[PDB]
Design a protein around this ligand. Sequence first.
Ligand SMILES: *[C@@H]1O[C@H](CO)[C@@H](O[C@@H]2O[C@H](CO)[C@@H](O)[C@H](O)[C@H]2NC(C)=O)[C@H](O)[C@H]1NC(C)=O
Ligand SMILES: *[C@@H]1O[C@H](CO)[C@@H](O)[C@H](O)[C@H]1NC(C)=O
Ligand SMILES: *[C@@H]1O[C@H](CO)[C@@H](O)[C@H](O)[C@H]1NC(C)=O
Ligand SMILES: *[C@@H]1O[C@H](CO)[C@@H](O)[C@H](O)[C@H]1NC(C)=O
Ligand SMILES: *[C@@H]1O[C@H](CO)[C@@H](O)[C@H](O)[C@H]1NC(C)=O
Ligand SMILES: *[C@@H]1O[C@H](CO)[C@@H](O)[C@H](O)[C@H]1NC(C)=O
Ligand SMILES: *[C@@H]1O[C@H](CO)[C@@H](O)[C@H](O)[C@H]1NC(C)=O
Ligand SMILES: *[C@@H]1O[C@H](CO)[C@@H](O)[C@H](O)[C@H]1NC(C)=O
Ligand SMILES: *[C@@H]1O[C@H](CO)[C@@H](O)[C@H](O)[C@H]1NC(C)=O
Lengths: 49, 608, 50, 38, 98, 98, 49
Amino acid sequence: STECSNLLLQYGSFCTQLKRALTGIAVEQDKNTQEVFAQVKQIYKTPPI
Amino acid sequence: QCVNLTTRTQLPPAYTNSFTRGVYYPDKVFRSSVLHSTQDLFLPFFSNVTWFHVIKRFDNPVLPFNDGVYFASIEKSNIIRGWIFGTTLDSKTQSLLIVNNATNVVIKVCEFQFCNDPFLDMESEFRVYSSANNCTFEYVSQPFLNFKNLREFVFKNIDGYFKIYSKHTPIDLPQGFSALEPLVDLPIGINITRFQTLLALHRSGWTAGAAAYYVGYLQPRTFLLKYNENGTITDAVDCALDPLSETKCTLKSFTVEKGIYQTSNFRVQPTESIVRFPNITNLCPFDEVFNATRFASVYAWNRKRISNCVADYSVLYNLAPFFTFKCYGVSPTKLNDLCFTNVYADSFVIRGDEVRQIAPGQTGNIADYNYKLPDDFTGCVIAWNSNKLDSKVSGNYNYLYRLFRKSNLKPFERDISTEIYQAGNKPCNGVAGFNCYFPLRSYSFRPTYGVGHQPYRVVVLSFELLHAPATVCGPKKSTNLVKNKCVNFNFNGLKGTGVLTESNKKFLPFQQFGRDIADTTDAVRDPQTLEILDITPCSFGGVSVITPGTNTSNQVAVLYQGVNCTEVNVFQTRAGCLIGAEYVNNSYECDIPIGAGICASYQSIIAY
Amino acid sequence: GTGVLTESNKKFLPFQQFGRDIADTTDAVRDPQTLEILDITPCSFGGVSV
Amino acid sequence: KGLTVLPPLLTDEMIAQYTSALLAGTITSGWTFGAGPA
Amino acid sequence: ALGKLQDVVNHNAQALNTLVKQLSSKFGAISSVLNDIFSRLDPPEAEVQIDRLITGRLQSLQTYVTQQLIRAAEIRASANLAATKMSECVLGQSKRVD
Amino acid sequence: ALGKLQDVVNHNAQALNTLVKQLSSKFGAISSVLNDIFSRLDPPEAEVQIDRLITGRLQSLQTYVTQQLIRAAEIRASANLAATKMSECVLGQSKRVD
Amino acid sequence: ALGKLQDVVNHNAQALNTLVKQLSSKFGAISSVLNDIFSRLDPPEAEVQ
Ligand SMILES: *[C@@H]1O[C@H](CO)[C@@H](O[C@@H]2O[C@H](CO)[C@@H](O)[C@H](O)[C@H]2NC(C)=O)[C@H](O)[C@H]1NC(C)=O
Ligand SMILES: *[C@@H]1O[C@H](CO)[C@@H](O)[C@H](O)[C@H]1NC(C)=O
Ligand SMILES: *[C@@H]1O[C@H](CO)[C@@H](O)[C@H](O)[C@H]1NC(C)=O
Ligand SMILES: *[C@@H]1O[C@H](CO)[C@@H](O)[C@H](O)[C@H]1NC(C)=O
Ligand SMILES: *[C@@H]1O[C@H](CO)[C@@H](O)[C@H](O)[C@H]1NC(C)=O
Ligand SMILES: *[C@@H]1O[C@H](CO)[C@@H](O)[C@H](O)[C@H]1NC(C)=O
Ligand SMILES: *[C@@H]1O[C@H](CO)[C@@H](O)[C@H](O)[C@H]1NC(C)=O
Ligand SMILES: *[C@@H]1O[C@H](CO)[C@@H](O)[C@H](O)[C@H]1NC(C)=O
Ligand SMILES: *[C@@H]1O[C@H](CO)[C@@H](O)[C@H](O)[C@H]1NC(C)=O
């Protein structure tokens, strides 16, 4: 509904707040994975034997 | 007086770039050192603005006003003097005239008989209009006015208010920024759809002085305005021009740091509206219910089923004899646009003061013991005076009401039982006597009584909303069905925007439409053809603008999240389709994270 | 409204009547009789802790 | 209906590659790789 | 054995399913479908009904974001613990008991 | 280099700024200014309009307080970590890797 | 000495007490009691209250 979006614009920055909080969570998950697994800057490999 | 000019040289009108012009102050509010977002009628940045010249060139066409007009004038010696606004530009309608002659600025609202070629011509010759009959408004104001002058004007006609914004600049169009100050707020309250500018000739036939003007059209959009310490608008951002400015508008800043920013959601818009209604058309017998000579009494109110007809309710609203046409669960004006089933007309006659009691949730005598409406009632109550038909000078006693009953009735319940009532401790045993009264008493309808007691005929139309296959519909015509395209459809009063596709869902014969987990309709059975169409919402996704700092570069790339590249430097990622970045097989450290192992950087913008 | 009216250093343009601050609240007004600009600082607000 | 799941920045194979690098460091070098050169 | 990760997946999927399910709530309006509200009422009362739906759905969405932030804090604490274990148990030998 | 503190300052200032910006939201009323409601409408409808503004602003304020509580939990966890680093890295030598 | 546990008990009890006291809030309605709304108003407006 276009008219619902027009009426939704009257409520201000609620949508921006929710998107910003979700974006913060989304970048936080990637930061968590970097902190746990990306603790070495060298990719070591095992010997073939 | 009118004069035809037949010495023109044929040339098509030119087009050029608007750059960052056409900005005006949205309101009369001072703001200092802030960024403010406005959704107003604005001119887009770098838009296609029409260019006209006056040099033998004499450009005076008549252009549509649309929703707003930006007029730019690269002017010397003040050839351009005014404008004409209206709809038909004759005495049939009312027109607005803006002129600035050699002495003073005149604003008039009259029914001018305009010339086909109106123009101006020491200046002692005025041939603009031949007559002005009905003048409703006059306003006299201050003088508004190598090429030396840039005159920028914005005309808007919103809510019958005509706003003129103006700016003068000492100078194709120059590239720069200049905010237009509001000049005239005009209370006209008339329709304007077409305009024409007024030029001035030079006579020595005639010669045209060197001038150039530009016409642009306003569209509803949002701008991000920057206000300095002195309250003067110095910069603006068009939020819908390019993804970089969209990012600037979203972050509410003119400088964007390096990173990926979620800005908006791309969604494909519908192309055409398809209405599907049942093909069957039978004139609905509203004449039988509403024009009948005799109605039933309120205790024995008549219920008529209405089904398998197309109903035109517009003939009921436009007629003036009915005092009350009051609807509760549906709008009166939308009845022609909807489809219904479970339609019932309940006809009875009541008093003048009792018409308030034919409503949900009312406390009263006929509400409790004659006709009860449910709390969730949808439909319309119709009441009109029937003193001319349902009254007699000797007393019309044919209409009876249940004065006494042991308990209140249920909704849509009729009681016609002529049993005696026990009003006291003593049982009555079916015989009248002390504290034993008949429940049904007749109204003493006479024409001599005042309003409030005169007989009123009330018809209650009861409907149900969309929860069954509909048999009663409005006069809207059925359109053809289109497959695999985004359309805004109306199926039996159900409006939606989606793509209609073939389906493999084995609907049972009773089943008409289908509902998903969220309960929004996902499939529907089309009338006339009885086929089952699947409804899928139109393509949409999140737009992320990958950009480095604005200090470094203005190049951007866009990521359409969860969207394959064939439904929108093109690279397909698991995260979505990336436009504007070139995939490089080399591996670098992650600079701007895209997702699914893909990162972006600036070196052009590369993705790796 | 209710507020302290002080003389303003703001240079309102001729069309401009009232002014909004950083947060879009009415911080300046032009008097309808004498065309001068006045800031409207709100009356002092404090948190009373015991 | 407006809900989307964004993919993680590190895919499963790259996370597995990081675990492989950590395993190779802790097997071939002990704790030396965590405090400096392996 | 793998209940913790499956539990996290279940909470995220269940929160999304609940958020989708909340669209089927009238929220004190005549219908849960916005298009019906437009197709049935005049703008003075349709505006009120659309408002009822918008405030209900917005409350649902803010509730979902609030539990997402609380779960994000819990998962961030668990990830900080996992990073500490990776640094101290995998990249070194720990004298910390248990 | 100092992004973490700058982020804390930016999130607190941005939350405060958004909270004041929410006062300029009509929330589905005729105006965002209470005085306009008193001057433009009779009390039977004025009570409804002020009720709408009060519920919208109260919901905004509750959202802000909830965000502050979640951020306070995050900062408390970071401060507990900082106190642990102050005790174990500054006031002693730590055998804990990284 | 035992302030931290007493604080936890106080916050839980105070939160419960506040949740109880919120039932005596009209929230804009004519009364905080549902029965009074059913008896004092018609169902079209009682539903709203
Ligand atoms: C200038 O030219 C225009 C266009 O040819 C003339 O307008 C027409 O005049 C004829 C006169 O018989 C009318 O029948 C038409 O209806 C007019 N057309 C329109 C669109 O108005 C105009 O009259 C000419 N000017 C003069 C002074 O003759
Ligand atoms: C402007 O419009 C003309 C035709 O109306 C077109 O030929 C021209 O390419 C357009 N200019 C731009 C920049 O799109
Ligand atoms: C204004 O006039 C145009 C045609 O000149 C017409 O299509 C439009 O409906 C009119 N608008 C109003 C509001 O009268
Ligand atoms: C300019 O127009 C006004 C309004 O018709 C008129 O009174 C005035 O005399 C005009 N000026 C000249 C020089 O004719
Ligand atoms: C407009 O003018 C015509 C002729 O001059 C006249 O008959 C008509 O009554 C006028 N209408 C109005 C509304 O002034
Ligand atoms: C603002 O005005 C002051 C004087 O009123 C002037 O010195 C200053 O340069 C102006 N700033 C801008 C950006 O115009
Ligand atoms: C309504 O009824 C009157 C007589 O009762 C009749 O003359 C008239 O034609 C009827 N009109 C319609 C539309 O049926
Ligand atoms: C009209 O609709 C009916 C079902 O309502 C269907 O049986 C019939 O075939 C349709 N006729 C046409 C010409 O579409
Ligand atoms: C009256 O008001 C005008 C502007 O509205 C102003 O210029 C003038 O000084 C005022 N006169 C007095 C006596 O206040």
